[model samples]
Target: YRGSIHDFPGFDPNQDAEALYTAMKGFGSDKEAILDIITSRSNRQRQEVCQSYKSLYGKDLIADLKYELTGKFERLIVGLMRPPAYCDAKEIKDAISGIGTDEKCLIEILASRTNEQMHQLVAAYKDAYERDLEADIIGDTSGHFQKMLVVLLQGTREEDDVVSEDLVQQDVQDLYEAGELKWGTDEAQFIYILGNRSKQHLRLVFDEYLKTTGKPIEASIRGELSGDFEKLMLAVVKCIRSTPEYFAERLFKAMKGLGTRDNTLIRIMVSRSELDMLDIREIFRTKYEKSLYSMIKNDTSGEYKKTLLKLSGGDDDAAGQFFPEAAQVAYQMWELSAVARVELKGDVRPANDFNPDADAKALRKAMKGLGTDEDTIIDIITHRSNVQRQQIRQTFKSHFGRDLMTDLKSEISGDLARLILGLMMPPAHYDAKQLKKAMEGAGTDEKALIEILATRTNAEIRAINEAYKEDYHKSLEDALSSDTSGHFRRILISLATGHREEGGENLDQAREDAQVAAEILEIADTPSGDKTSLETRFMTILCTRSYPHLRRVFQEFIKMTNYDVEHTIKKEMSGDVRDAFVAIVQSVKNKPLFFADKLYKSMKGAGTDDKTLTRIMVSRSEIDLLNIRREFIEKYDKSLHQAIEGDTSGDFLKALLALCGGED
Candidate 1:
């Protein structure tokens, strides 16, 4: 989200190199010429000039600049000398290899990169040092810090753009359970999720987490975790929330203290100049009520100030930030409640004159035409609340001797038909049908299966099962067992069996369970351990325990051995058993976040998984769909309605949007 200032319209690397060389050699250094050549070119362009200087003069541009310049000015010119990836790699190595780690540098580079970019850095690190980045980080950092860095270095975060409210809730709850809700901090849980989840997903998690606990995620981290670990996690949350904003805050801090943080200021300004320095500047001004240009001018002197100002696009007046139309739309939506005074227009409640019979008749007439009046059908069906829709259904049948759902099905096909029908059915029945639809085809929809089965309460699952049998003449278990195989199938059946207890915690029993779990995991870790035996133990313990009891066991297990149950599972298990165990842990810790994560995965890549989208929205609308919508917006930085509208169309789109209710 940082801004870049140099467009470098008519680039000439040779000319710039010779000009730089002349400025440095002939005089004490033509400071203006140095600033003009260095500041006007992009990082890529600067690297090119360095290569041109080496090829032409058998001299390194950096060496010459260092020879001629001093202090912060020299640092600024030298910083712009290397390729970005290589530069980041060198910085990371320097941060770790020093007497005491330059943790701030570590956080800045590691927490802010994309998965692909991190992969590049890791490769570059290995190339540069002939030592593995992961191994080096592991050797240098310990405990949760090491865990987070290792996870980040592995590039294991969910890099796709899918947002999950349920996952956000789960993560927040997990963090809460690990920190504020529990006796002590479960630093690993915080590290695992923050370091492993995608930044977009983490942003939603942090937002909902704040709403859920009335304390910011960063505040919680600061309270529970400390030192470099706390700083990195806070940086992760801040960067995830808004990279530009984070940088703006960093820039402010750099200039705010008694002595300016010159390295930080130069690094941020140079790196972001070509990307989002413009946005950072705006954020700085808005947040600090002071212009970044003025701050830079006041803090530094001579060529440094000139170079930084030019790279910052000169004074505040010259800074122009462009926001996408979609972003503007989102801003308007979020700001509507405060900005728009609807009170002057009187009460905006639904009409008191809601005549179900009249609307029912209107809907019947609309659909009865030679060509179906889709808009009329949509208006009546989509505008009314679920209760109103139910009444309209009854009224339509009573007055017209026709089934509204059956008639609508005949009139509307595809997604529109599915959506309207979804609204009309009770949620359990709707979910049952979705489950059935997911399995009816030749290939089963595993995502729909995980989403529904993994997220639902035991009671909800039982209701869905009864609805499935009543509606489809088959048990939910039968349908699942036939389509799924091995460990996944067993997990589905275990969840479907409704065996999870809702009872309170039993510390003694939990300790016993933890010991059992640990023993099973220990055996699983052995070279000759029975994998099947380990799978059985994991399934039994994860599926049968009450959520509260399982959480206690997890806590106890970690305390007894200082080993995270999640880490053990990840290390010792594989395939569906691993997936099921992780899901159970997530659900036990935070069911809503698990659902949110599922929802995010459903919509993240390529074509939309419409069935998953519809199923989650339809099933959870009554229970926690609103929370899910909040999570969705927080995670994706766009409304669920917007995502549905973009991914779907027609009456179906209208119905889904209706279910979304309004922007979060």
Candidate 2:
């Protein structure tokens, strides 16, 4: 068997279950006994042991472990019993809803799972999580990347295979004719064919395409598409080529770097331990010129290291890291029931040795030359917290009669300029400036306008309102109303009131609002109904209700009508009105997810939306980013550090990475 785990010699579930429970006997546990049995046993019989535990003890096994294990070790242990689909379920959800939308990780998982696996996983995800798995993906991601995912989620890969060379030749011609033989490649055709073709049939087409075009299909995809779309297609082609090789490469990449992507490292080791992991290990050794077992030993540390090493099923090494002395020390510590705690502060804490004068001088020197030393400028600005940057700003003006913002703008241009300037502005002013510019242009940047207006808290929105009038000599509502017209205009003005119920809930009233929405939406859904008239009622409830009440209203709406707020609105309304309503709902539901979607869109598209990217990172770099970063770092291998690395280039990428602080 390629799998590291095998059936135990005695194969007694009752004994194994008793062993685990007895290991936890008395008030203290035997750590060595647990790991020995847990890691030594095969994955297939894990549940029967759980069954044995339940009948014998009359308490849940998972809950008992949850009570005992702590921190990262607990996470690893708890996840071990969840089997393959549960692992994929949480992984996929984390990739979508987590920070920076670990798009590649999402593609990596869904691209490889077979049709049956796909069906089982979505079912697992539905049962495990509150939101629909498909809803989570659609809400967070956009473009052809989202399209391919939805296609894969349907789990209808054309697997009823009889080799059809005639059809294969058409697909080859179609793809070739779309890209190389046509004027602007038809990306839809590429997404459709590549996303749906059966696995073996795709391999056949690749072989025939070599004979047809003298180039592999990946070459065609690379040339035709760009950005995330290209990566998804390339990932799909690679997964079809070899799933084990893809996983092997993934395992190597995570461990090869300065720090491990232990989330990826742990996941691949655990999920693949019982299924095709031996094949993955062979490929790892063959391709990398190093053993997976040895690499983990070097890459990881502490209990996280030990747990993964146990699962890695060491081929070249003995999976060695267990030492008796430490276990004895831990036993002693446990006996005392010692309690100690340390505080954690995430990225962008104030610098301990902060010096504004020195930092100001450094900035001037960096920007003084004919060619700006962008590295120096980025380093000085990025290292200091925003409060320090504010002090540095004042120092620059005092030292030289030039406004620091002007001097920096004069020297720097492009994304780098945008980022540094954003760093210099207070967040309220930044929001104020963006709202003003969004409405100032001939055609309104309504999307930008809606995002700023919809997501800000009541207090923040008021501050921006004050900042707006101070900076622009016009009230925000006045500018908003003048720039916008029709139903969309009223929605923005209503949002500008800065009052969506913050902490209020009434179940009866909520159902009333929900009934108003559902019944009103029903009117619009019928023939000859004015969707616009009812859309205002939709706007009224959205703008007036407390966030908690609004959520309750949505729940009650769903209870009465099968559709969600997002579903019903898009069903009954269209254009800017629907989008604005959806934006408010999204923000209220989870501000982090709202910010997360914006974060991904900022980096994922054709050109970096540096303005939005810089604004979010600079403004939220204080506290909210780690919450955003929590979505990525907590789940996927790609930290926001890595997200921006592959997405953009130059001083902008460098500056953004520094602002991201540490990978953890």
Identify the leading candidate in terms of TM-score.
Answer: 1
Candidate 2 segments whose C-alpha is farther than 4 A from its true place:
1-346, 524-535, 632-637
Residue 74 in candidate 2, Cα distance off native in Å? 42
lDDT of 2 by residue, 176-288 (tens): 88886776678898778877888888877776765566556665665467677777777778777667767877887786445777777767888778766766765565444
* TM per prediction: 0.52, 0.50
Clashing residue pairs in candidate 2 (N, C-alpha, C atoms within 3 angstroms): 99-631, 501-546
Candidate number of the best lDDT: 2
Clashes of each: 19, 2
How accurate locally is residue 508 in candidate 1, as Cα lDDT from 0 to 100?
96
lDDT of 1 by residue, 197-226 (tens): 887788677667655665566555654776
Q: Model 2 residue 330 lDDT?
A: 23
